[PDB]
Design a protein around this ligand. Structure first.
Ligand SMILES: *[C@@H]1O[C@H](CO)[C@@H](O[C@@H]2O[C@H](CO)[C@@H](O[C@@H]3O[C@H](CO)[C@@H](O)[C@H](O[C@H]4O[C@H](CO)[C@@H](O)[C@H](O)[C@@H]4O)[C@@H]3O)[C@H](O)[C@H]2NC(C)=O)[C@H](O)[C@H]1NC(C)=O
Ligand SMILES: *[C@@H]1O[C@H](CO)[C@@H](O[C@@H]2O[C@H](CO)[C@@H](O[C@@H]3O[C@H](CO)[C@@H](O)[C@H](O[C@H]4O[C@H](CO)[C@@H](O)[C@H](O)[C@@H]4O)[C@@H]3O)[C@H](O)[C@H]2NC(C)=O)[C@H](O)[C@H]1NC(C)=O
Ligand SMILES: *[C@@H]1O[C@H](CO)[C@@H](O[C@@H]2O[C@H](CO)[C@@H](O)[C@H](O)[C@H]2NC(C)=O)[C@H](O)[C@H]1NC(C)=O
Ligand SMILES: *[C@@H]1O[C@H](CO)[C@@H](O[C@@H]2O[C@H](CO)[C@@H](O)[C@H](O)[C@H]2NC(C)=O)[C@H](O)[C@H]1NC(C)=O
Ligand SMILES: *[C@@H]1O[C@H](CO)[C@@H](O[C@@H]2O[C@H](CO)[C@@H](O)[C@H](O)[C@H]2NC(C)=O)[C@H](O)[C@H]1NC(C)=O
Ligand SMILES: *[C@@H]1O[C@H](CO)[C@@H](O[C@@H]2O[C@H](CO)[C@@H](O)[C@H](O)[C@H]2NC(C)=O)[C@H](O)[C@H]1NC(C)=O
Ligand SMILES: *[C@@H]1O[C@H](CO)[C@@H](O[C@@H]2O[C@H](CO)[C@@H](O)[C@H](O)[C@H]2NC(C)=O)[C@H](O)[C@H]1NC(C)=O
Ligand SMILES: *[C@@H]1O[C@H](CO)[C@@H](O[C@@H]2O[C@H](CO)[C@@H](O)[C@H](O)[C@H]2NC(C)=O)[C@H](O)[C@H]1NC(C)=O
Ligand SMILES: *[C@@H]1O[C@H](CO)[C@@H](O)[C@H](O)[C@H]1NC(C)=O
Ligand SMILES: *[C@@H]1O[C@H](CO)[C@@H](O)[C@H](O)[C@H]1NC(C)=O
Ligand SMILES: *[C@@H]1O[C@H](CO)[C@@H](O)[C@H](O)[C@H]1NC(C)=O
Ligand SMILES: *[C@@H]1O[C@H](CO)[C@@H](O)[C@H](O)[C@H]1NC(C)=O
Ligand SMILES: *[C@@H]1O[C@H](CO)[C@@H](O)[C@H](O)[C@H]1NC(C)=O
Ligand SMILES: *[C@@H]1O[C@H](CO)[C@@H](O)[C@H](O)[C@H]1NC(C)=O
Ligand SMILES: N[C@@H](Cn1oc(=O)[nH]c1=O)C(=O)O
Ligand SMILES: N[C@@H](Cn1oc(=O)[nH]c1=O)C(=O)O
Ligand SMILES: [Ca+2]
Ligand SMILES: [Ca+2]
Ligand SMILES: [Cl-]
Ligand SMILES: [Cl-]
Ligand SMILES: [Zn+2]
Ligand SMILES: [Zn+2]
Ligand SMILES: [Zn+2]
Ligand SMILES: [Zn+2]
Lengths: 687, 687
């Protein structure tokens, strides 16, 4: 029973694991990581799992040339290099030791050394570029863009700048976004020092996994494409800096005023758009010499076999590779997984077994484009779609200590509300009250009324293949701060210390997340009828149908000129509601003793998410096939609904051929409509 | 029990039905057909099915302009029209009546009226064009091609000629292929008169269904493409003639000798390739004025619910629409379906029910590109792939009276051998012996030894969506003559009389096919463990791996220059064999009393075919996704194995960039390999 499962999870053990997991750096593709993989394997065996496998792949990674450093210079009249950027972050107290920490870099930047005139662009979000080029009419072509971390996935900014003719991109972290007021820098607080630099990859893989083998696993015989047709390589070099060097590049900034205060961080400078320097005169030069190279990577997979339905897969997965020590990202998740596995292996040993099979993966190479988990899905896709019940993700557990944060598919809302109601909040001041209670109090849904917010699912972490390509019901949970991240995210300062001292001394937030996570696994893996409520879907679907409808009405002139009708979507959506009522009625009324009828319904429940998948995929993104959600085309971290239609509606006034554009909005609508209906009828009586 | 099912099927009833089904013409989209649909619906209800539905679609059909006739003229110096082609076939005795029989035409021809010089091209198969243009070096560009029915799907010839710059195509049926020696023309024998003309469609839909809605159902709201982007429309006009008119166009034929006797039918003429006439002087002119138009069509669907596993679908389907009366194609199949349904509805009434749900479809619009069945699959694709156990096809039952003819997926070979062994042959001279016996004797497998031939599955009839796009195990059976067809195929002479008098007076061949067909349904629908032998697949897979390997060796120079290795395929194939052994072992050993374990294995069996599907599809043909079989790119009627690799190997010497070509052969190999392995591991233990 569940009560048992939970009681067995101990905070102390988590501390133990997190400490063990973050003494040395753990970069994808390095021996340190191969060795940790070898370790997780044994202790998982030891904790009593039936089988623990390594699965390895040979994929494209990316590194800095050790003997020939990346950096930014400023250059005078005859390229005297006046100023240079750091070559590494000042290491935290007690890691001179730190034998080799990769220097900052943007993974997969093309090689290059371009020169030209900074133009500042803010976040390099779509609208900034709109603001720049439609109003200011400042022109990015030929220039070097410097932009600031925060807001949207860094791969989006580099794609944007590229679109806008740029020839280089420099990212920096502005205290504006990474400096909580009144807290002190590491080692003494948790604010990011002006020395540190957010590492991270900049690919736009859009779901393909290893860029050389879209569609198939990158195993021994896998045919690989030319780096020249690689999926999602930028063609302009990119590099990141802390706010000290930043300041030094920002401070001489020419051309216009920031078109407004929304464009200005807390660096003491003009934040001038540009281009040029005021030093007229002086110019910027990047030095990028990283190389890309096929490298081998290692996933850890441990089966805990089902006793009743060994052919139903519940999957708990998180990544193992870090940019540096990774005290928060990923090892605070990893630690939690570990205590979870051990706790299961414990009941198992007491002679207990789950109704369904549970799978535990330590993923590899997350930081380089969700490569580790993806190739595995590509290899096992058939077994996953005919058997995958649900996937729970397990990256960082805390990124803040203020409240819970959950994203998931509507089919888990009910289970998540029930489960959080059966758990103690560990918030200062809700000792005594439930986790549903604190969470609801602190974080209340827009969608109303007495309801904790739960978010959509975009991409940006390892659940993406499983929900967006395959249609397996997915979800995640972690503790958050009151997209930009936390200040010391993906930097040398993410250390075990960072957690013990400042985030969760008690380890009570870890162990809450360890309960939401293992608790969801547990329910999903063991409960006689699947925890899904097909009705919640019927709810959000009608909200979403409204949202998209409102958007279109921004243009009723056209809507009339072209007979743009949402009746089909609403019609489809109504039918869904109706069928799910009837369905759940039936779900109430049927002797749980009849196993065949049971299995038949859980199949209806299980394959329901699968019903929102189009084999053709969304336009231009073949590996994004959920019709209801995909990653935002403007920010991959953010999920969007009816992406097919939103994307067609987006920025539509700017299109030359309005009849063709509006035609495609219609096509998109008619695909949504049919897919909602088609899904619905999976819930209808089977004969 | 099965014995009962069979005994209940009566030849007399079949005659009854076939007679009823062929008194008037039954063209897709006409009221006669809507009415027959209305009929099948009631009698199916009456015969005792639980539900019988109409499902309707609005798809692109194609007709001749009634007030403005299609035809071929010859034209002198100042376009005097000297000779014209028939405008209809002389109707058989007793159908002046015949109120309106569509005139011959090729469906979906573009409109046009071009002039130029016949060039004769034989069958318009790929090699003929090779022969013409690589040897003869006779150049088809600018010309009008006349070619002869037979050998390959008529859509292939029109595509070929188009490729070869042609500006028109005339098909004819040459007594060479449609005149069995020593038999007399209809009404007196079954040879095709020189008046009659094979009707038929010429689209290259390559799996898409209704050309306006590839991917989605053509329901009420479905967005439709411009006829200008329609899927698989030819852009040169086509038209068919009997051998009388043929002769008149063939007789003046200029340029070269037929490059050999393989190129010559039994018309008394030179069979001169051309181009030009000898009449120098005179020229050919086509007159095509057909129109394409969205029209509504009607499928009939009848459920017979399962008692144990109502969520497993066994499907028996055949088409209902005819080009004229359709005494053979389709109504000899349809009649058989009818007697089959009635027979089931009979046991049902006696209070019996199948273990699984059986589905019975009368399909619409087969003759126009497999449209009827396809749109239905597109609409229900989700329900079909998570539930479709198998599909048996039911077009024409006899096309000859000499032996059985079966095509199917390897997973049905065993069931088909067992079942035919339990049935009486109805061959003159095997009274006393089994149907396995006569069939084996008359038609012995190349693949050896004491084994009836069974063929691959291409396309060319309604099973195509179900096997080639969806991966549902498919099969078919009918009586055959000792691709070209039978002489009176798709002509006015296909009548009830044609069958009673010449093919099967007794109705004993019908009723054998009615037994193979209903018998397979019965087993598949009712047997406790699915009739599939995953081992037979392990057999043919290794044969196929050999075939393709032999092909490549035609080029060992290259094979060496590029390290072209099949090890991966063989490796994959070996693994398959091994896993299926082990699998079937397990299948022997497991208490059939445990329902959950039962269901789990039948799922492994059921989804196994599904495992050979690639969501990305084969190159250029997105709706052909079986990696093991697709339709031949040179003849859609013919199935080919490892189509992905064969097609890359095909005609490879002619390619400019041999490194790119050979690279793609490799890619193709590595996809086969992985897919065979991936399938295999579905058969592995589930945890
Ligand atoms: C939501 O669920 C409901 C089922 O409860 C479903 O209802 C269906 O609506 C369809 C779509 O319009 C109805 O369509 C009609 O079918 C009849 C035959 O029964 C036809 O005669 C109609 O066609 C005539 O009129 C057309 C429309 O104006 C003309 O274009 C045409 O030329 C004809 O003259 C029409 O096709 C259908 O009957 C029902 N089925 C029912 C009511 O049970 C609805 O479609 C579902 N929504 C979605 C988005 O899938
Ligand atoms: C058919 O089924 C069998 C399983 O019975 C399956 O066997 C596998 O073969 C793979 C493919 O080659 C083996 O691959 C090796 O794995 C080890 C680790 O265990 C590696 O060290 C090897 O890599 C080294 O050598 C490579 C190859 O020459 C070098 O490129 C590389 O740099 C390394 O130094 C290699 O990757 C694997 O061990 C087995 N699994 C087994 C034997 O259980 C076979 O692949 C299946 N066939 C197909 C087509 O899928
Ligand atoms: C982290 O924890 C693990 C597990 O206890 C330690 O691994 C063991 O330590 C020693 C090596 O000094 C060996 O005797 C055991 O083989 C190790 N077990 C393994 C490899 O699973 C690991 O060394 C600890 N590492 C750190 C960095 O604290
Ligand atoms: C920034 O670093 C650069 C690169 O090393 C320095 O310029 C180099 O100085 C070496 C040693 O004198 C020269 O011989 C190389 O020509 C230089 N490289 C280039 C491309 O200029 C430079 O000293 C630095 N500028 C500052 C502010 O220290
Ligand atoms: C969450 O809890 C609610 C109430 O516990 C569950 O819905 C109830 O389940 C019982 C047991 O079947 C039903 O008979 C009641 O009708 C339900 N109450 C309501 C308001 O529906 C729901 O099952 C739970 N969600 C889960 C566990 O997935
Ligand atoms: C073929 O068979 C059917 C079924 O017996 C005949 O349909 C019945 O005939 C008369 C109409 O004259 C009606 O009283 C019944 O309603 C019909 N039943 C139906 C429509 O299912 C049908 O007329 C026969 N047609 C031919 C061409 O022989
Ligand atoms: C072939 O049929 C054509 C088409 O009708 C005949 O030519 C037509 O004759 C009518 C009646 O005299 C003319 O006024 C039209 O100009 C003709 N149409 C064309 C395009 O020529 C012609 O008589 C026929 N040839 C033969 C052998 O009977
Ligand atoms: C076709 O018949 C053969 C023999 O009837 C079947 O294989 C036998 O099935 C029995 C019953 O399980 C097994 O114990 C024997 O080992 C089998 N004999 C052989 C040679 O395998 C096979 O099941 C049948 N194929 C079907 C019905 O799908
Ligand atoms: C690293 O630097 C050297 C020369 O400074 C370069 O030639 C070498 O190939 C580099 N290694 C790579 C590209 O991995
Ligand atoms: C931007 O500037 C460059 C001039 O170097 C030019 O080539 C490009 O067409 C310009 N376009 C815009 C967006 O004004
Ligand atoms: C954890 O403790 C307190 C409670 O609000 C908070 O102020 C502190 O900043 C928290 N940890 C972090 C690093 O946010
Ligand atoms: C049939 O023939 C006439 C004129 O001869 C043509 O204008 C009419 O539109 C045609 N009907 C069609 C194209 O369906
Ligand atoms: C075939 O003939 C025509 C001349 O009308 C020409 O335009 C085309 O290039 C020729 N090509 C071949 C295949 O010889
Ligand atoms: C049916 O009967 C005999 C047996 O061989 C055959 O010669 C005749 O041609 C058959 N039917 C047809 C039309 O082939
Ligand atoms: N979570 C990582 C990895 N990352 O997430 C993606 O979706 N792509 C990608 O590289 C990051 O945000 O840096
Ligand atoms: N069976 C018919 C229909 N036909 O089969 C296809 O595969 N396409 C198509 O139009 C024929 O052969 O004429
Ligand atoms: Ca891959
Ligand atoms: Ca369609
Ligand atoms: Cl997560
Ligand atoms: Cl058939
Ligand atoms: Zn992470
Ligand atoms: Zn990360
Ligand atoms: Zn047919
Ligand atoms: Zn036909």
């Amino acid at each position: 029973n569940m009560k048992a499962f939970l009681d067995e999870l101990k905070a102390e053990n988590i501390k133990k694991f997190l400490y063990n997991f973050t003494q040395i750096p753990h970069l994808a593709g390095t021996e340190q990581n191969f060795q940790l993989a070898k370790q997780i394997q044994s202790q998982w065996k030891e904790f009593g799992l039936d089988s623990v496998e390594l699965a390895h792949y040979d994929v494209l990674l990316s590194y800095p040339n050790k003997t020939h450093p990346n950096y930014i210079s400023i250059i005078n009249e005859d390229g005297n290099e006046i100023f240079n950027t750091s070559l590494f972050e000042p290491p935290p107290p007690g890691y001179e030791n730190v034998s080799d920490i990769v220097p900052p870099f943007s993974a997969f930047s093309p090689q290059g050394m371009p020169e030209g005139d900074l133009v500042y662009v803010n976040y390099a979000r779509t609208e900034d570029f709109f603001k720049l080029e439609r109003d200011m009419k400042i022109n990015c072509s030929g220039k070097i863009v410097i932009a600031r971390y925060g807001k949207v996935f860094r791969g989006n900014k580099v794609k944007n700048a590229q679109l806008a003719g740029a020839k280089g991109v420099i990212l920096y972290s502005d205290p504006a976004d990474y400096f909580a007021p009144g807290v002190k820098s590491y080692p003494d607080g948790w604010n990011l020092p002006g020395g540190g630099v957010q590492r991270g990859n900049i690919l736009n893989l859009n779901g393909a996994g290893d860029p050389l083998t879209p569609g198939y696993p990158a195993n021994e015989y896998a045919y690989r494409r030319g780096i020249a047709e690689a999926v999602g390589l930028p063609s302009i070099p990119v590099h990141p800096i802390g706010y000290y060097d930043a300041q030094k590049l920002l401070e001489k900034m020419g051309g216009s005023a920031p078109p407004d205060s929304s464009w200005r961080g807390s660096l003491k400078v003009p934040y001038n758009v540009g281009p040029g320097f005021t030093f007229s005169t002086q110019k910027v030069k990047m030095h990028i010499h990283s190389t890309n190279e096929v490298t081998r990577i290692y996933n850890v997979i441990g089966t805990l076999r089902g006793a009743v339905e060994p052919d139903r897969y519940v999957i708990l997965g998180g990544h193992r590779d870090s940019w540096v020590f990774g005290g928060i990202d990923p090892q605070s998740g990893a630690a939690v997984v570990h205590e979870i596995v051990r706790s299961f292996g414990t009941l198992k040993k007491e002679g207990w077994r789950p109704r369904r099979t549970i799978l535990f993966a330590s993923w590899d190479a997350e930081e380089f484009g969700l490569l580790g988990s993806t190739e595995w899905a590509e290899e096992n896709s058939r077994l996953l779609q005919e058997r995958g019940v649900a996937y729970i993700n397990a990256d960082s557990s805390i990124e803040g200590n203020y409240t819970l944060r959950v994203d998931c598919t509507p089919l888990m809302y009910s289970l998540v509300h029930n489960l959080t109601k059966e758990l103690k909040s560990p918030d200062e001041g809700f000792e005594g009250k439930s986790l549903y209670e604190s969470w609801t109090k602190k974080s209340p849904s827009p969608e109303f009324s007495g309801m904790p917010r739960i978010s959509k699912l975009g991409s940006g972490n390892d659940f993406e293949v499983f929900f967006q390509r395959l249609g397996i019901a997915s979800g995640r949970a972690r503790y958050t701060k009151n997209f930009s991240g936390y200040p010391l995210y993906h930097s040398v300062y993410e250390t075990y210390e960072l957690v013990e001292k400042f985030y969760d001394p008690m380890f009570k937030y870890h162990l809450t997340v360890a309960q939401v996570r293992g608790g969801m696994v547990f329910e999903l893996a063991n409960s006689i009828v699947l925890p899904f409520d097909c009705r919640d879907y019927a709810v959000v679907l009608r909200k979403y149908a409204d949202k998209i409808y409102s958007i279109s009405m921004k243009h009723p002139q056209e809507m009339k000129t072209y007979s743009v009708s949402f009746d089909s979507l609403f019609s489809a959506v109504k039918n869904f509601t109706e069928i799910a009522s009837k369905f759940s009625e039936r779900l109430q009324d049927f002797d749980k003793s009849n196993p065949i009828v049971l299995r038949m319904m859980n199949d209806q429940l299980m394959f329901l998410e699968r019903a929102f998948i189009d084999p053709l995929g969304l336009p231009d993104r073949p590996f994004y096939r959920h019709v209801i959600y995909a990653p935002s085309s403007h920010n991959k971290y953010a999920g969007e609904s009816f992406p097919g239609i939103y994307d067609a509606l987006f920025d539509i006034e700017s299109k030359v051929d309005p009849s063709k554009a509006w035609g495609e909005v219609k096509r998109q609508i008619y695909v949504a409509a049919f897919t909602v209906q088609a899904a619905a009828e999976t819930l209808s009586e089977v004969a």
